[PDB]
């Protein structure tokens, strides 16, 4: 009941009240996937994730250089995790929900997607299934995405003191909440951390899919995810 205050403050920052979807700007007998538009949609989602991060406690106090490093470290993880949590909210094994409200059957991606994309999607759905079995909730969701945001080793930043505090306070918050709210079997704190390891592994496969598209000149010319890929991580 006594939800940690960090988690409370993070829910208040969470923009979703239908507003993310409205704000997303690709401007609106079945057919091939709308590739360019799907790209656009993902780019705008990245935009909204940076909007989120710049409003976050701790982060908004850091100087721009540190903010950039942190986001350079985690951008693909945040996007994958964004997509994953959308799928736990969806609660359908047979299709994927997109931020636009559009659902894509998994049979569709089986017929159209190449080797790489298909693997990626499927591996992601396994992770969705895992988080559903852990009864993942919105409180845990926002805590976990703050954790991902600050999942960079201190040494890479100017401001150690504040980032260390955020890293420590965020984990403590997750433990406290899972311990109080999931009095069930399994250490849920630890299981969720294991999930984050998988989110990171997925996001690596995602960048490699991206890099594949880029080398074959298949991406839109001014794609934001490609610009993020190409800037020194």
């Amino acid at each position: 009941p006594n939800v940690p205050e960090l988690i409370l403050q993070l829910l208040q920052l969470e923009p979703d009240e239908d507003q993310v979807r409205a704000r997303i700007l690709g401007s609106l007998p079945d057919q091939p996937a709308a590739f360019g538009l799907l790209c656009r949609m993902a780019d705008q989602t990245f935009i909204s994730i940076v909007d989120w991060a710049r409003r976050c406690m701790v982060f908004k106090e850091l100087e721009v250089a540190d903010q950039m490093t942190l986001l350079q470290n985690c951008w693909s993880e945040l996007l994958v995790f964004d997509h994953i949590y959308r799928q736990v909210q969806h609660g359908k094994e047979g299709s994927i929900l997109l931020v636009t409200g559009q659902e894509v059957e998994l049979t569709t991606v089986a017929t159209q997607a190449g080797s790489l994309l298909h693997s990626l999607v499927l591996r992601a759905q396994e992770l969705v299934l895992q988080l559903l079995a852990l009864q993942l909730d919105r409180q845990e969701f926002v805590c976990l995405k703050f954790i991902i945001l600050f999942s960079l080793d201190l040494k890479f930043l100017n401001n150690h003191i504040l980032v260390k505090d955020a890293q420590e306070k965020a984990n403590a918050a997750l433990l406290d909440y899972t311990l109080c709210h999931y009095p069930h079997s399994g250490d849920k704190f630890q299981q969720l951390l294991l999930c984050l390891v998988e989110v990171r592994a997925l996001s690596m496969q995602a960048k490699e899919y991206l890099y594949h598209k880029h080398l074959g000149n298949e991406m839109p010319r001014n794609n934001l995810l490609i610009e993020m890929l190409q800037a020194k991580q």
């Binding site: 935009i47 940076v50 710049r54 250089a65 950039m68 986001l71 934001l224 610009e227 993020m228 800037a231």
Partner: peptide, 12 residues
């Protein structure tokens, strides 16, 4: 340094 990240963090 990432010109896009600076832009999105400075403004848009």
């Amino acid at each position: 340094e990432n010109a896009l990240l600076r832009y999105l963090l400075d403004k848009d």
